[PDB]
Design a binder for this molecule. Structure first.
Ligand SMILES: Nc1ncnc2c1ncn2[C@@H]1O[C@H](COP(=O)(O)OP(=O)(O)NP(=O)(O)O)[C@@H](O)[C@H]1O
Ligand SMILES: Nc1ncnc2c1ncn2[C@@H]1O[C@H](COP(=O)(O)OP(=O)(O)NP(=O)(O)O)[C@@H](O)[C@H]1O
Ligand SMILES: [Mg+2]
Ligand SMILES: [Mg+2]
Lengths: 378, 378
């Protein structure tokens, strides 16, 4: 009976069952937005991508964005994708990783938080934080799903440079090379080579490159006060309104209605062609499966439109003519999984509210939505 | 401070600190839930306030018992006894028990191993295509971890012994098993737990959680073939999925249209009053957030209706449907440990489910058709 039952390690379970950590490691046929460089705008495309591969990139991206929360003096993210060499680099400025041996773990802190599961600066929820990072997995998950993983950082308090290489799904950990550093700014650079074989791929194809690239545009659109560079090119999205307007050409009384509701909430609206559509971000994370924040906003808009039509029309008819954009900040958010695709935090625990002004719903009532809704009623 | 800022925690510590991706929220949630009304012998939808994590730890034990029918098709009986006043919950199943044997690798008794250590399972070899609900080797331990007291009792006829082992204080206390001679009796497994109500923000099991727990036991009777289920000694009476779906009749040409499509798929249909509704089961797991199996079935029905209608938008057809699905899926994958949403691709199901024209024609005899013709004319 012994063979019937097995005990496995945390690390073994991640490699065996990637789904709850990074999403599927199988190819998925998806309708995805990508940024078209020739038309300088968003295009919806049928792609085939491996979610887990996109997600290990996303983990490093959101970590960089989180450092802007930790250090508001940070000014730039650099993303460099070397397709041919399957190598991806993510660099941020502002404060680096402290080059110190940890009191308890007795290893260098960078080795600790990039090379050991369940390590985080986000474990003390006494503090209400608007970082995306929550559970102490993201960076290690990337490491685990890489043939090679390199952490480079510079710390000004100690005046040192720190380079550490992991290999073979985080199973090989080389000692760090630490050198002297009085060379300008602090920074962190993460350089990884995904285990493409683990994702059933031989190379980075145009589909995955397209969505990776677009995700970088997302970061620029959702995070304020940073410059975002992709393969050397400054993306120069000035704000979330500018980001949403990248979708303008494809969608085509304004086509997009944008409003900043408060310091933690921005929303945009457009009329949807076939069914309900949403693009939303919580603390820079792309909530592709929506959740409590999306529902909080849409419910308000649908509720009011229903009242207007009443003085015949079911709520679903209203909702399915809506394309909503949301950029929001939520305190200590909770999600259905590590992939953080769906927010579960109750509204009352958001740390803020977003009461959509009646005048904004009035503007929605001038769009094609109302004409469609008055045809069903009358 | 840097040592205080960055923390390493154990897997056990993480589960208790951050329950969400393991068992769901430990905060109260307002939910619309189906309840079994005993006075009117039917399902009724009620607004309830429950703690999802508490409901979930109960569900893990229920699904484990259901899984034993796959292991041993001769299993006939599940008893669920809720002693509200004592907040003790018991789940007992007959058929083959847990082997009372020292594991050849782990060097401890198998029950101690698979109920008292994380990441232990008989479901880690996916070379076998199984239709068990169990996948990750967490479920039983999660219940234990969120219990003040957790008792496994089992009888094993191969060694002719009975085994009783008690854990206390969130699995932190593991008492040695009591093993006794057991001759001339049936095999069985009985799990008895007292949920750590302090960790769920509760003092007692109120009517809302009891109602939802009891309904979940009806689900099990409805979804598991050829078993008899009891709640506090009282037979649940239903024998199959058709019977189960019929419990919803009073709330909902027949009102409900049911068909077994094959040995792994049953589907029932009713006209929905407000919007799209689904009740679905994968390997006896309640997939309350739907997923690929639900989409597979509904896409077909929608596509087939749409083709006949034009001889209207897809969401208009979809949202007049109430779909019931009971299916068996090979080695399923889900968004999280809570298994609310199936992600397995259709091609990986291990079977197919083509909805026949006869079934579609019968749907076209219901209110859905005349509602669609109303939209078509205008
Ligand atoms: N670019 C960066 N700059 C500074 N600190 C970083 C950076 N990336 C990661 N860290 C630190 O490393 C820790 C581990 O990162 P990570 O593994 O992604 O976990 P996390 O972000 O805290 N939580 P999660 O991403 O939800 O699993 C983080 O808590 C940060 O404190
Ligand atoms: N009532 C039962 N009868 C027989 N075997 C059981 C029973 N309950 C649990 N087990 C066994 O104990 C193991 C551990 O259970 P569990 O922790 O729930 O993991 P799992 O069911 O395999 N996977 P998961 O529930 O998805 O985390 C299972 O693999 C079963 O083999
Ligand atoms: Mg992170
Ligand atoms: Mg289980």
């Amino acid at each position: 009976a012994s063979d019937k039952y097995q005990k496995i390690s945390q690390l073994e379970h991640i490699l065996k069952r990637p789904d709850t950590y990074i999403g599927s490691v199988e190819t998925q046929e998806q309708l995805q937005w990508i940024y078209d460089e020739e038309t300088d705008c968003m295009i919806e495309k049928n792609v085939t991508i491996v979610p887990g591969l996109f997600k290990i990139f996303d983990e490093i991206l959101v970590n960089a964005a989180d450092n802007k929360v930790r250090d508001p003096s940070m000014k730039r993210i650099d993303v460099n994708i070397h397709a041919e060499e399957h190598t991806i680099e993510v660099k941020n400025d502002g404060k680096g990783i402290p080059i110190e041996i940890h009191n308890k773990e007795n290893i260098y802190i960078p080795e600790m938080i990039f090379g050991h599961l369940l390590t985080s600066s986000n474990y003390d929820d006494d503090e209400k934080k608007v970082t995306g990072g929550r559970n102490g997995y993201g960076a290690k998950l990337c490491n685990i799903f890489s043939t090679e993983f390199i952490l480079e950082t510079a710390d000004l308090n100690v005046g040192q440079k720190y380079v550490q290489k992991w290999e073979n799904n985080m199973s090989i950990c080389h000692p760090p090379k630490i050198t002297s550093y009085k060379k300008g700014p602090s920074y962190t650079k993460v350089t990884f080579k995904p285990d493409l074989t683990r994702f059933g791929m031989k190379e980075l194809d145009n589909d995955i490159l397209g969505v990776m690239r677009r995700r970088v545009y997302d970061i620029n659109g959702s995070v304020r006060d940073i410059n975002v560079y992709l393969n050397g090119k400054s993306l120069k999205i000035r704000n979330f309104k500018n980001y949403v307007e990248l979708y303008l050409k494809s969608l085509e009384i304004p086509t997009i209605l944008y409003e900043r509701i408060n310091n933690r909430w921005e929303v945009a609206f457009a009329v949807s062609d076939i069914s309900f559509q949403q693009i939303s971000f919580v603390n820079s994370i792309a909530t592709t499966m929506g959740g409590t924040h999306v529902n909080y906003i849409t419910d308000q808009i649908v509720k009011k439109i229903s009242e207007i039509l009443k003085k015949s029309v079911k709520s679903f008819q209203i909702k399915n003519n809506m394309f909503i954009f949301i950029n929001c900040l939520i305190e200590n958010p909770a999600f259905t999984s590590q992939t953080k695709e769906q927010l579960t935090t109750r509204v009352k625990d958001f740390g803020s509210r977003c009461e959509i002004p009646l005048e904004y719903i009035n503007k929605i009532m001038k769009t094609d939505l109302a004409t469609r809704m008055f045809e069903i009623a009358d």
